[PDB]
């Protein structure tokens, strides 16, 4: 590695760390996902979300 | 060196490398929607055991689904050699229902036939390892079996069933368990005292999609080209020891068909597609004094020796007109799968493809049985004159004859695999064509 | 669960899922021209029997043809273990001809060599089931055997022969039947009294096209990239107990070549590519006092036991220059198949590819021998000093030493597979290069 | 009659297969490709070849792109047939891939065994065994040349061939470690074999010679390749016993988009031993006879599909404390995972969990990015080591949750992770996008 | 499990640890009376036991789970029964011949709301602050003599 | 200090909360923002002959029974807060980890 | 290399610094940017009487 | 045994050899091992079998 090639030392294997920050002060503070149902069966529910007065009567 | 090859360039290479279009040294991988696969246990409604019938509702614990495995825990009712794919035998059948409509259904025999034709090599061995005892396990041994389902969505991600697009329809699987399983709770016609009932669990592998794909699947209509199994069980003209039994079977099938498949069997013994004989592996105790040609060596029920197969010849006829020239049973047992599958098919199991590649997903040619007024399969059986207890007769015989024990192969199972369309829209779905 | 994986997203994922292009959970099946396939029997011209040459003309009963299977009926002239792929041995050779021009040719040995290199697993086993007796059948057993042909159009629909576009040319196959088939009409050199002549029939699988596809095929010119086999049999510089023979064989080959393949063999024993020995399967009676290392256990003729192979090393030179550094015979037997095919090649059979993937239809690099004046295959043989009748002598020996019985492998068969182009137009056709 | 009668039987259900047709199967048009040739070149090995020694080689600038690497060894048998197990694989203790002075990847003899156990199959696996072992019942003193192919990203596909001419300032090197001992070659269990020969080693690299235009492009253009890397650490296996099901939580020190995890438990003494020893055929030296001793394996049959000898009862992977899937049995990771995703047959004692649809392919098909997980953990439950290994009745007639008393010898745990990274080549230098 | 998601999970040992720390006095005793034999009962005796669950919604009406507001989701409980229970089917490691298999029943106490409250629950979004149990089993660095 | 009951021997508690026994949060330790949380334990010497109560009952602080080495399993629990959201007919947890 | 003294058996040092015995920083390993640091040890066989 | 070398760049970082600045010039070390080492392979003039 000589000359201007060393100047290109960022495009060679000097691979930056993927883990930007630790668990303390961020790092994994944006990896939280709400564990929903992900695919509900609205068949039994689309009678209680809109048809509420009929269920009350 | 390699340079001596590069320099050897002539007019004849223009067809291969002139005006080149591709290289082999630059693979471009396609960026894909982010997703993840989670294996989730399903509940089972109803007790399981021999003769029980239960069902599951596929829980809404993902957006799309593919692979499904039914687990069983069985205990051996006898020693090694007494069972044959017992988890396959146990799962008598599985029915797929969407919105109350039947979409498809598989049978234990289908799983056996399917495997016999379409699985191969170590895929087949690993399969056997998940359905049977293959390391000489002994009586009382306990094992968990994993028998995968083979519905259209259980074979490729490409057909993942969009549960999320079926917001108003339930998706269910009904599982029928066999009344008896050889070497587990029964030994031929006798029950095995003290046999345990199976433990069962159904596992579904769910696909979790990222935000944009989830939205599209939930909101857009979809059309998935799917496979369906059709099955008709029937009487086999009982093979005769004095002549050649023959039979004309009404092929009461519909839809564009990828292929037909069939086997002849002895219903007493699961997987027995051939005659019993006193040659090693062909019967219980075969090869010695204690051999009987009334009971198979269950652990070696299957065989590749067509001398023990019953079918002499067959043809498919459509509307009174031959579909192809009559071919011998061995043509349907060995050539068809050579050409169309690339695996090896056990004796007694037959295939006739209408497709170039029936083992694949792409509909590479189909026969529309919904456009036939009178479809039929014509079979001719071998003369069953060979003394099954005498290896000289069993092994030294002719092309047109079989064992006298081949007359026990009285059941015929004809399967057909076709292509239909499963249309999903506005949260509901079902098949485009009834027949 | 799966959700915890989806959210585990960062910079490293841009290369895999950023600006996504595809999904895996919805596939597109391409709509295709409606077609149907029918298996139709052809009539054989000439008398069928051992040693005879027969032929057939392919009937215009459909538009395109692909698979061709020759059905034969053979019987056993001895017990299990006396035959080795006898239906394959029976078809001594086969030629494909269009308008009188030979397009290609295969030989019984080629079928064995092809199989040894390119078929595998249960494809290979099922193949064996269609050409041999593999369930310990006994003398007198009769069996119908199916020998698929391996001409370019018999391997892929992509090259279905456009009989419909050849309105002005006949298409024929010629088949030479072996004078003798081991364990069927002869036990080694000994004729089997009462042996039957074989039954033979040729089946062609036809494709019926729909109206528009058919019209285009009948009318339009076509250029089908096809494969051809080249072959010359020659003498082996037979090695011996006291020496490592060597040989330089000019390769009289031409056209863009995908690969070379070869084997050494004993002409007497079909499929014998290795030496015989008193070890299981390596000879009749092997493992005991009655063993004879002059006759193979025919049903077990093939083996993976490299010790019984005869090539120490080899290289190919083109215009006197090494095409590659010298490698051992075991390279050509075990590694080339690993690198280029993925199956397992039996001892005595060798491969050298000029292509990345020679087993496929699509060109992936070729050596054009029409532009090479002197191409030579250089072979160095192993020392034949092992006393084959003593298992210890064989099983415990060195890399470069083989059986004294290895000197029986006096024939060498060198094959090459190349490309050519079959041109069809004006209802006629033939090859681009003669 | 015949096939024409099928074509004319056309209707509405054919439209979704053949209407407005897009393709045919009967007209293949091949792609024209750049001209290139492949040549095998022997590399010079620096250092000193011998057991336990470290050697290295610089891949010589004899081509434009490089792919296959094969390490040849000449080994001899220090004992009779049955005393060796993939000895050429065992000998190549490890290999490190270095570009421009930095590590790109590193494989281990055990990885090669694990990789093979999971990803090779059928006759490929057999042919592989033929290149690393003695499989024709060879005897003491026998000599063979073995070929150990490497499996770095560029050693599997030309698509990822490494453009060595583009690395004008950086060399590509291979560092190899040879094992101090190889079973059945220079040692027999713990004993050295007097008179054993030192290995002969040779390293071969397959070079791709491109034609002029392509060579220029590779030297001049920057390149990026999506490539594979192997992450690996060894851990102590919690020791199970006759009185307990040991449990262990192993924090996984992994990073990058991971296609899959793979692991095995083993006995460090005996290469490839992933299962317990037992007095059943193939499960120990002398199994089946008076000499059967369950302290030493039948080396030639070290690997096995006999699950009862496996040591793992069940497992799960947690990501940041959340189970990534419902707990599955060890046999699920051994038989099913590879059934569904690979299609081969995995030996007992070797486990796989995929985050990918196709863990065996080049194309990413779903990955778990461990760089974004703060606490990934592999949770393992071991079987109870209560079965008397010397008694087949106990070995073979036992239950799902137990194994051999000899399974406690499998004290080492090897956990691997297969991930992606990006190889970068620019301005004469190599590179890696991520740490 | 709520909506297919694992909300929480308790272990027999957790019930024991929880009890050891949080129940007390007669509450603890009454609890013991519902899970054990505390009047010197003899072999062959039969008893119905009641194991209250300790999930967040099982401790206070304040966290009552709004099944009413989970119109599109199911709520399920999964229970693992021990392979062995001391003094019932096993004595230390020894199986007890003749031991009976357990009878089981799951009871849920439901709240029926009147029209105004019921309507609000079905229609409004809710955020219920809940407790969860985290648990890992470990090998102890067992002290030496 | 924090519960008011009596805890059996061998069971230990450490609170980050004023009242761990209540529903209402009363101080918590958020381990989602801690990289290396470790419980460091020191064990007693198992020197006492358990078959002689005098050996046990009259002994000191840093020792225990020889039979205490049978206590090889350790169970560590943590009780935390999360949020169960119910909206538009469906639920899920606000936090995965 | 790094201190210039003699270290007793059983005591081990690994420096990230050119001169660890001095006051002035001379190269450091910042573990505040390391999520997973591990010391991997292999012990000798303790078989000598 | 460990034998530190005593070349000028082996004594201080101040003289660290700038291999990077020596692009085109390789740096090699040639080590000659003694024919005999006392108490290892020879005792005075007597070779140790």
């Amino acid at each position: 590695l000589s000359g201007e090639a060393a100047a290109m030392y960022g495009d060679v294997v000097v691979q930056k760390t993927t883990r930007a920050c630790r668990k303390s002060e961020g790092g994994f503070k944006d990896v939280n996902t709400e564990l929903w149902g992900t695919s509900p069966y609205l068949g039994r529910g689309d009678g209680e979300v809109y048809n509420m007065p009929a269920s009350n009567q | 060196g390699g340079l001596s090859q590069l320099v050897a360039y002539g007019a004849q290479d223009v067809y291969l490398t002139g005006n080149p279009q591709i290289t082999f040294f630059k693979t471009v991988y396609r960026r894909y929607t982010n997703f993840a696969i989670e294996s989730i246990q399903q509940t089972i409604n109803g007790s399981v055991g021999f003769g029980n019938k239960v069902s599951t509702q596929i829980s809404r614990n993902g957006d799309l689904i593919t692979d499904i495995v039914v687990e069983f825990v069985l205990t051996k009712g006898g020693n090694g050699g007494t069972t044959y794919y017992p988890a396959e035998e146990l799962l008598q059948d599985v029915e797929l229902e969407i919105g109350g409509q039947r979409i498809d259904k598989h049978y234990n025999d289908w799983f056996r036939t399917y495997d016999a034709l379409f699985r191969m090599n170590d895929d087949r061995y690993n399969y056997r390892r998940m359905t049977d005892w293959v390391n000489n396990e002994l009586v009382g041994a306990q094992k968990r079996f994993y028998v995968p389902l083979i519905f259209f969505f259980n074979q490729t991600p490409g057909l993942a069933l969009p549960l999320i697009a079926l917001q108003y329809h339930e998706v269910k699987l009904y599982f029928t368990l066999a009344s008896q399983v050889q070497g587990v709770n029964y030994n031929g016609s006798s029950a095995i005292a003290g046999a345990a009932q199976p433990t069962m669990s159904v596992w579904v592998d769910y696909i979790f999609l990222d935000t944009q794909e989830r939205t599209r699947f939930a909101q857009l209509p979809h059309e998935y080209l799917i496979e369906q199994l059709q099955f008709t069980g029937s009487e086999t003209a009982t093979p005769s020891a004095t002549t050649q039994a023959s039979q004309n079977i009404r092929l009461n099938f519909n839809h564009p068909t990828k292929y037909l498949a069939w086997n002849f069997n002895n219903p007493t013994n699961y997987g027995q597609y051939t005659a019993l004989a006193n040659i090693p592996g062909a019967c219980s105790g075969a090869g010695t004094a204690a051999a009987t040609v009334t009971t198979p060596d269950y652990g070696n029920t299957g065989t590749y020796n067509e001398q023990l197969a019953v079918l002499d010849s067959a043809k498919i006829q459509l509307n009174g007109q031959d579909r192809f020239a009559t071919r011998k049973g061995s043509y349907f047992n060995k050539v068809q799968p050579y050409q169309s599958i690339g695996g090896v098919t056990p004796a007694g199991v037959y295939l006739y493809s209408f497709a170039l590649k029936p083992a694949g997903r792409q509909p590479s040619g189909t026969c529309n049985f919904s456009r036939i007024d009178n479809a039929t399969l014509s079979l001719t059986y071998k003369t069953c004159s060979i003394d099954a207890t005498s290896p000289a007769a069993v092994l030294g015989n002719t092309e047109t004859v079989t064992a006298n024990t081949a007359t026990l192969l009285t059941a015929l199972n004809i399967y057909a695999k076709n292509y239909n369309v499963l249309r999903i829209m506005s949260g509901m779905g079902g098949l485009a064509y009834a027949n």
Side-chain angles (χ1 to χ4, degrees), chain A residues 1-7 9-10 12 14 16-22 24-28 31 33 35 37-41 43 45 47 49 51-56, chain B residues 1-59 61-435:
Chain A
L1 205 65
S2 178
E4 62 264 41
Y9 209 51
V12 305
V14 189
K16 312 307 183 312
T17 300
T18 189
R19 301 160 160 269
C21 299
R22 303 187 290 164
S24 274
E25 285 171 67
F28 320 123
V31 80
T33 312
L35 321 176
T38 332
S39 295
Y41 164 56
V49 283
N51 257 336
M52 209 50 194
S55 158
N56 264 318
Chain B
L3 292 173
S4 69
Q5 183 177 326
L6 293 175
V7 75
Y9 176 80
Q12 294 182 269
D13 291 302
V14 72
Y15 289 106
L16 273 64
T17 63
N19 299 320
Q21 297 173 305
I22 64 169
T23 186
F24 298 105
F25 310 114
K26 184 178 178 180
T27 295
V28 63
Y29 295 101
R30 293 182 183 174
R31 298 186 300 269
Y32 65 96
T33 184
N34 193 290
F35 67 91
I37 309 299
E38 184 181 337
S39 183
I40 300 176
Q41 190 173 35
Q42 301 295 303
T43 59
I44 300 170
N45 291 313
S47 296
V48 299
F50 290 106
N52 290 106
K53 183 174 179 179
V54 299
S55 68
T56 65
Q57 181 169 348
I58 298 171
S59 66
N61 301 358
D63 297 294
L64 313 175
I65 60 172
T66 56
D67 298 352
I68 300 178
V69 178
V70 180
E71 294 181 0
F72 295 99
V73 182
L74 309 177
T75 59
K76 291 183 72 61
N79 291 319
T82 63
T83 60
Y84 188 68
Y85 291 86
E88 182 179 1
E89 184 176 17
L90 178 59
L91 183 58
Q92 180 179 291
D93 60 51
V94 182
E95 181 177 354
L96 175 66
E97 183 184 77
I98 300 178
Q101 184 181 78
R102 178 179 292 171
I103 303 302
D104 203 356
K105 186 169 184 175
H106 298 294
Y107 305 88
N108 57 3
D109 191 73
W110 175 240
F111 281 96
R112 184 63 301 269
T113 298
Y114 175 79
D115 187 70
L117 293 172
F118 293 93
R119 294 198 180 88
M120 61 188 77
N121 304 336
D122 291 350
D123 186 67
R124 178 174 288 165
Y125 178 62
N126 193 60
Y127 176 79
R128 184 178 182 179
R129 292 175 72 206
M130 293 188 291
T131 59
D132 206 352
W133 288 269
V134 297
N135 293 280
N136 299 318
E137 294 89 342
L138 302 173
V139 65
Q142 186 182 50
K143 184 173 288 297
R144 184 176 298 268
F145 295 99
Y146 301 93
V147 55
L149 301 182
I150 56 172
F151 290 110
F152 68 89
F153 62 89
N154 298 135
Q155 295 189 43
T156 179
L159 298 176
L161 187 69
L163 293 175
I164 197 165
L166 293 167
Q167 292 92 325
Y168 291 94
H169 284 183
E170 295 185 317
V171 179
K172 293 178 174 173
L173 296 172
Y174 297 83
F175 301 85
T176 302
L177 305 176
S179 64
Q180 61 184 64
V181 177
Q182 169 64 45
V184 179
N185 66 331
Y186 295 89
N187 188 36
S189 68
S190 296
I192 299 170
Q197 300 300 305
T199 297
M200 181 177 166
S201 176
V202 178
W203 289 86
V204 178
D205 290 348
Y206 289 85
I207 298 158
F208 287 83
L209 299 172
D210 200 355
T211 298
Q212 290 73 13
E213 291 296 305
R214 288 178 68 215
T215 299
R216 290 190 189 97
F217 278 97
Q219 299 299 305
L220 300 177
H222 306 278
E223 294 186 0
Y224 294 88
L225 180 66
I226 64 166
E227 299 180 356
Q228 295 180 291
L229 182 70
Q230 298 176 64
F231 168 65
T232 179
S234 67
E235 180 180 358
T236 301
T238 301
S240 174
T242 62
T243 190
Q244 294 190 264
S246 65
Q247 184 177 8
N248 298 311
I249 301 168
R250 183 177 181 89
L251 293 171
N252 189 7
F253 295 119
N254 284 282
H255 302 285
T257 297
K258 179 62 173 171
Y259 63 88
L260 303 182
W262 63 94
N263 69 65
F264 301 91
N265 65 74
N266 181 339
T268 299
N269 302 314
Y270 178 79
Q272 183 184 338
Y273 301 118
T274 63
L276 300 172
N278 190 16
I279 62 171
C283 69
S284 174
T288 190
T292 175
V293 296
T294 63
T295 301
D297 182 356
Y298 289 107
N300 293 296
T301 299
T303 184
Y304 295 105
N305 187 359
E306 69 270 30
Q307 290 175 314
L308 299 177
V310 74
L311 187 66
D312 184 27
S313 69
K315 64 176 181 177
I316 299 168
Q317 184 179 87
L318 304 175
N319 299 323
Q321 297 174 89
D322 291 346
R323 174 59 182 75
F324 61 92
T326 303
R327 305 297 294 274
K328 304 296 294 186
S330 64
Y331 172 90
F332 292 100
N333 183 243
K334 294 183 281 195
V335 176
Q336 281 279 317
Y338 174 79
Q339 291 174 286
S340 66
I341 298 173
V344 61
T345 300
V349 179
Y350 303 98
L351 171 69
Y352 185 79
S353 177
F354 301 106
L356 293 168
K357 296 181 180 180
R361 300 285 79 76
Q362 173 70 49
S364 55
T366 62
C367 178
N368 187 347
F369 281 86
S370 293
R371 299 291 295 145
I372 306 299
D373 298 314
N374 296 285
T376 185
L377 176 66
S378 294
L379 304 173
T380 301
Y381 301 105
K382 292 182 178 184
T383 301
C384 301
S385 63
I386 299 300
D387 183 350
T389 64
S390 178
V394 174
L395 297 172
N397 64 51
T398 63
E399 181 67 20
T400 59
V401 300
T402 190
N404 64 316
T405 55
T407 63
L408 298 173
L409 300 172
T410 62
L412 165 62
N413 292 334
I414 302 167
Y415 299 95
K417 184 178 278 280
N418 65 279
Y419 293 89
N420 204 327
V421 177
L422 178 60
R423 175 178 296 89
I424 304 98
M425 62 182 285
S426 298
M428 297 171 280
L431 299 173
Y433 301 91
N435 299 118

